[PDB]
């Protein structure tokens, strides 16, 4: 009816949005019930990066974490993956969109990071960009630990070690189940005949720099065995040195 043509009009507005105030019908989108229909009327695939930054701003600011999760999984993350794949870098507006999406961390981890990791096709540039984005944002310890348990339990991809390492650089107090999952993942790399890159070695090195004081002696010797079986000419002496000069408790 009359609502449909107004939302076609604001669809035409959002396809060319650069700056300024948006219509007030756009800002009351989360307060409505049938949001998916009017959102598909607004055609988010044809949005401008500034318009999607404002949409992420609005949707993150208005509570209801499940709906923010659905918006991040359905609209924001495909746009990010399409922009990295074609432009080989992330836009300024979309970068601040992902930061304002990390304003809501619970919908972010379960909507942006974990679906990207379980998609399997996550490239290295996407890993670097998203890891820098989680590096900039201060993250709650519970959400970071749950995401680290998630990424530890998953099947390995080369992009996963960057996320794991940049989560270990946060230097938070770690739950001991999380460290058990990390050690079990690395000891799951014990019998792999695949050549592992320097990224995996750097993730292990980071785990030994920051959490060597909270490692049991049995898993310490297991990590020494791990270094023995899967060596590197450069990093493995340093990981061995850091494991040798560690005090527990």
Partner 1 sequence: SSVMRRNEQLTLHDERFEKFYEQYSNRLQEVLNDYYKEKAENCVKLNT
Partner RNA sequence: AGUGGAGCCUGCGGCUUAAUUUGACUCAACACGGGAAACCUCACCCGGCCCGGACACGGACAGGAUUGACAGAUUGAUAGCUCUUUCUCGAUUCCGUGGGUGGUGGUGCAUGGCCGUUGUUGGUGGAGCGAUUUGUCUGGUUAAUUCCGAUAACGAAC
Q: How far is the CB of 25 from partner 1 (least distance, A)?
A: 5
Q: How far is the CB of 243 from partner 1 (least distance, A)?
A: 16
**Where does this chain bind partner 1 (CB under 8 A)?**
2-3, 6, 9-10, 23-25, 28, 31-32, 109-110, 142, 145-147, 149-150, 173, 175-177, 180-181, 183-184, 216, 218-219, 249
HEC sequence for 93-144: HHHHHHHHHCCCHHHHHHHHHHHHHHHCCCCHHHHHHHHHHHHHCCCCHHHH
Q: How far is the CB of 8 from partner 1 (least distance, A)?
A: 12
- Whichever of 191 and 234 has its CB closer to partner 1, that residue is 191
Positive or negative, the CA dihedral 175, 177, 178, 182 is positive
Q: Which of partner 1, RNA, none does residue 79 bind to, with CB < 5 to 8 Å depending on kind?
A: none
Q: CB–CB of 97/130 below 8 Å? A: no
Please state, in angstroms and rounded to a whole number, the distance separating the CA atoms of residues 198 and 143: 27
| Residue list 24-43, contact with RNA (CB under 7 A) | 24, 27
Distances (CA, A) of 197 to 17, 87, 130, 202, 230: 43, 26, 20, 9, 11
Q: Is 194 in the site for RNA (CB under 7 A)?
A: no
Q: Which of partner 1, RNA, none does residue 28 bind to, with CB < 5 to 8 Å depending on kind?
A: partner 1
Q: How far is the CB of 197 from partner 1 (least distance, A)?
A: 25
Long-range contacts of 19-23 (CB under 8 A, 24+ apart): 19/50, 22/51, 22/54
Q: Which residue of 53, 59, 71, 95 would you call a contact of RNA, by CB under 7 A?
A: 95
**What number of chain residues touch RNA (CB under 7 A)?**
33
Q: CB–CB of 52/18 below 8 Å? A: no
Q: Which of partner 1, RNA, none does residue 218 bind to, with CB < 5 to 8 Å depending on kind?
A: partner 1
Other beta carbons less than 10 A from residue 209's beta carbon:
14
Site residues (CB under 7 A) for RNA? 19-21, 23-24, 27, 57-58, 60-61, 63, 89-92, 95, 102-105, 128-129, 132, 135-141, 169-171
């Amino acid at each position: 009816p009359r609502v449909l043509e107004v939302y076609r009009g604001v669809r035409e507005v959002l396809s060319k949005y650069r700056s300024g105030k948006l219509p007030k019908a756009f800002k009351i989108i989360p307060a409505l019930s049938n949001w998916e229909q009017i959102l598909y009327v607004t055609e988010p695939e044809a949005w401008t990066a500034a318009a999607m930054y404002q949409a992420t701003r609005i949707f993150a600011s208005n509570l209801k974490e499940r709906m923010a999760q659905r918006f991040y999984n359905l609209v924001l993350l495909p746009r990010v993956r399409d922009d990295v794949a074609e432009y080989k870098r992330l836009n300024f507006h979309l970068y601040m969109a992902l930061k304002k999406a990390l304003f809501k961390p619970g919908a972010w981890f379960k909507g942006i990071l974990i679906p990207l990791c379980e998609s399997g096709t996550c490239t290295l540039r996407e890993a670097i960009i998203v890891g820098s984005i989680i590096t900039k944002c201060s993250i709650p310890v519970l959400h970071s630990s749950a995401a680290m348990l998630k990424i530890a339990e998953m099947e390995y991809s080369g992009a996963n070690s960057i996320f794991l390492r940049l989560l270990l650089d946060k230097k938070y107090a770690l739950p001991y189940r999380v460290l058990d999952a990390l050690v079990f993942h690395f000891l799951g790399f014990r019998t792999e005949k695949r050549e592992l890159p320097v990224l995996w070695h750097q993730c292990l090195l980071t785990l030994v720099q920051r959490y060597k004081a909270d490692l049991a002696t049995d898993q310490k010797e297991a990590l020494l065995e791990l270094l023995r079986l899967q060596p590197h000419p450069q990093l493995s002496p340093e990981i061995r040195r850091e494991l040798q000069s560690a005090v527990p408790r």
